RNA sequence: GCCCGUACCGCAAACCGACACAGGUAGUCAAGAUGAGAAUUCUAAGGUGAGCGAGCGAACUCUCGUUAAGGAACUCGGCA
RNA sequence: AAGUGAGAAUGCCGGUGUGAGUAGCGAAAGACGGGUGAGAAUCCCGUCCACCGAUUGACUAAGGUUUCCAGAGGAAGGCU
RNA sequence: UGACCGAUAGUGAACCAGUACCGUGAGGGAAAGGUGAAAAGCACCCCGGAAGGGGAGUGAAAUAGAACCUGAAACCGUGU
RNA sequence: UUAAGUUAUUAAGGGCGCACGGUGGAUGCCUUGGCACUAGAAGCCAAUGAAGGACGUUACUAACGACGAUAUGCUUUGGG
């Protein structure tokens, strides 16, 4: 049995997220949230909250143990992006690019 | 630097207009077309 | 000062080898059930 | 030595720092702030012990002439609580002794917190 | 004892410059010390702390200060 | 019976790349204490320090056309 | 009525069209259709300040949940 | 055990094949909107104030249409 949490549509681009998603993968529940804690990105408070999420589903829906729990998979997907505009100089202007992300993280128990 | 098109009320009102475009035969065409087209803003 | 040729997806990820994050020491609390930093101290980690 | 702004700046706000550590007990600014704010507030704890009127008016050339403590309900002028409480209460071989306690890192940028009180 | 304007910005984050743009925009009033002065350096009032920070003190670029002995030998030219 | 077959016209329109976590983030000097909150270098009060100083002061006119006051915010918005 | 078009086609306009926007002015001139048969548009419980999830429930279908028929490439990821 | 000689293990990362995701809106199907004609009405409006507008009128809403201080309408025929 395992269990899942998706944050869907978060703003921040997804490859300053995915930089943060290669330190708790394959690891336990327990050391997982405290690297975590210790990590200074701004993508780490934002992470703890799902991974905290996903472990009180299987407490409720599941009733399994949390000492023995460990993270299975952990990505993060692209989303929809915003266009905006700055202006330049001798009146040509560029582009600006709003990125989303779609951080997914599943909970197992070391079986299927 | 100073630009162009120095904002001034009674000026835009003296140089075009209704009162203005409805004085001659060459202006008063240009409130036929714009009226023919559809536009919702005539002078 | 541009570009002569693109770059392939093959070149791209091989520049993104070492572009990575370090693990923080994590200095267990003696007792007191919470993390306190390497040389600091936390509310919770009473260590 | 170390630096941040200009040298006139730099001068001015380590003498803010100083006397805001000799009205308040235990503050919480930057590292390297409070690792150069530790040998301007000893050298004035050791011109306390004398007692002196010479290293009175030497210890006017660095303390503010201001910031009237409101939590004594009277008149004191730092200086006065310096030469009369602060001087009276060390008796040590590192004259106005203090320690300094790291923790976590700031939100806004990555500035690592840490505390110096008076000790 | 009729009719119209009266808010708010206005030497500027609200006007003209595509932008919260080191630019442009007619008039009136304007205190002390040093001085002939609306010049020059401080200041009373009034207005603000200006829209990313923290460490470090490499090469190189830009603004600024000083220099032994010589004094245009520099250079298209005492250019700066 | 035909608007019948797409790889090239510095072809027209839309979507997504590479350069790259690179260039940049455009006027004054800030420092600490208390408060508010899920979250504070950035918001509110207080004390000290500094800048403009014939002006980044005060008031008429042109021009713009609710940006003005109070209470509540989900983002978008504001070069963090 | 049609060996006419079927949303880059057909009128510039199937919807917020001579409208957003651009120019002192004459003038120039877009993008944008589709949940289900019927809102029966997720009652309730759990994590979070909220956004959004995981169960449950409505339905023939919830990978039909308003980024709402079908969902192709470029491009971005995880396991092997 | 020595001395000589022949071959390994590792995967920081990359390559190919397969399985499952996300972004994007091509393709298929559909139609409130158009295009070309045919038969027949028709081919004007206005000092009895026109075409087109400005400001208004709902019980509640901004457009859009209708309406005019008798203002989302009146009196008179019917059909229904």
């Keep these: 049995?395992?269990?899942?949490?998706?944050?869907?549509?978060?703003?921040?681009?997804?490859?300053?997220?995915?930089?943060?998603?290669?330190?708790?993968?394959?690891?336990?529940?327990?050391?997982?949230?405290?690297?975590?804690?210790?990590?200074?990105?701004?993508?780490?408070?934002?992470?703890?909250?799902?991974?905290?999420?996903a472990l009180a589903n299987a407490e409720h829906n599941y009733d399994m143990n949390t000492d023995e729990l460990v993270v299975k998979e952990?990505?993060?997907?692209?989303?929809?992006?915003?266009?905006?505009?700055?202006?330049?100089?001798?009146?040509?202007?560029?582009?600006?690019?709003?990125?989303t992300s779609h951080i997914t993280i599943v909970v197992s128990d070391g079986k299927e | 630097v100073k630009r162009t098109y120095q904002p001034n009320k009674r000026k835009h009102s003296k140089v075009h207009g209704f009162r203005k475009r409805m004085s001659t035969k060459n202006g008063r065409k240009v409130l036929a077309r714009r009226r023919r087209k559809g536009r919702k803003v005539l002078s | 000062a541009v570009p002569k040729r693109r770059t392939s997806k093959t070149r791209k990820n091989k520049r993104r080898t070492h572009f990575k994050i370090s693990v923080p020491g994590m200095t267990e609390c003696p007792n007191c059930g919470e993390y306190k930093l390497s040389h600091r101290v936390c509310k919770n980690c009473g260590s | 030595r170390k630096l941040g702004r200009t040298s006139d700046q730099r001068k001015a706000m380590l003498r803010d720092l100083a006397t805001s550590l000799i009205i308040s007990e235990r503050?919480?600014?930057?590292?390297?702030?409070?690792?150069?704010?530790?040998?301007?507030?000893?050298k004035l704890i050791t011109l306390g012990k004398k007692g002196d009127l010479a290293s009175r008016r030497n210890a006017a050339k660095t303390l503010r002439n201001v910031e009237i403590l409101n939590e004594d309900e009277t008149t004191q002028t730092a200086l006065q609580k310096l030469f009369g409480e602060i001087a009276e209460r060390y008796t040590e071989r590192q004259g106005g002794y203090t320690r300094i306690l790291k923790q976590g890192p700031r939100r806004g940028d990555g500035a690592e917190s840490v505390i110096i009180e008076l000790v």
């Design chain 1, 1 to 53: 049995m395992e269990a899942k949490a998706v944050a869907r549509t978060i703003r921040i681009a997804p490859r300053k997220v995915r930089l943060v998603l290669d330190l708790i993968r394959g690891k336990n529940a327990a050391e997982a949230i405290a690297i975590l804690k210790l990590t200074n990105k701004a993508s780490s408070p934002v992470i703890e909250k799902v991974l905290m999420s």
């Design chain 1, 74 to 99: 952990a990505y993060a997907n692209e989303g929809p992006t915003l266009k905006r505009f700055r202006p330049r100089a001798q009146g040509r202007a560029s582009a600006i690019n709003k990125r």
């Design chain 4, 27 to 42: 503050i919480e600014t930057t590292e390297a702030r409070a690792k150069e704010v530790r040998s301007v507030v000893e």
